[PDB]
Amino acid sequence: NYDPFVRHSVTVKADRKTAFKTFLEGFPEWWPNNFRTTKVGAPLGVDKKGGRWYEIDEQGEEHTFGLIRKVDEPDTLVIGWRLNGFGRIDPDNSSEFTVTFVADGQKKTRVDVEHTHFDRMGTKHAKRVRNGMDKGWPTILQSFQDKIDEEGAKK
């Protein structure tokens, strides 16, 4: 991905409702990278009323934030990139990925994320992305589907 286009696809075990919940409404409460404090797992994570991904930073609530331009219910989320591992550099502006949750009636949901702007824009752009995405974002998706599995049929 990212060189041509970057796409995220996960399979949710309990409908688009839980996919959206676990992706937006619950940012820092699952089991991935989002469990570390002031990294991506402080008592906040995502702001529903304003539309941005950020946590309460220890220095004074001044965290890099995910640029939500569209919060379209449990369906689609168009957000610009922020930062994951807290050990990486990102512009906190462009990137932009359209999160498309494709609902499966049997309480299943395949999300297909179209991401194309910042990372695609060449070696160094994608290189600064890889600086801390590699052990975060893909891993987020794992624990993401895993806690969703809990909400669905793990228990």
Token readout for 18 is 């839980």
**How many domains does one find in the chain?**
1
Give the CA radius of gyration of the chain. Answer: 15
CATH number of the domain within which 129 lies? 3.30.530.20
Print the domain residue range for 131.
1-155
| Cβ neighbour number for residue 128 with a 10 Å cutoff | 16
Retrieve residue 100's tokens. 């498309």
Number of C-beta neighbours around residue 42 at 10 A: 19
Q: Using CB atoms within 10 A of its CB, is residue 1 exposed (0-12), middle (13-18) or buried (19+)?
A: middle
- Calpha distance 44→110 (Å, rounded): 26
Mark 2-27 as b/e (b = at least 16 C-beta within 10 Å). Answer: beeebebebebbbbbbbbbbbbbebb
Question: For residue 140, what are its two tokens?
Answer: 């987020």
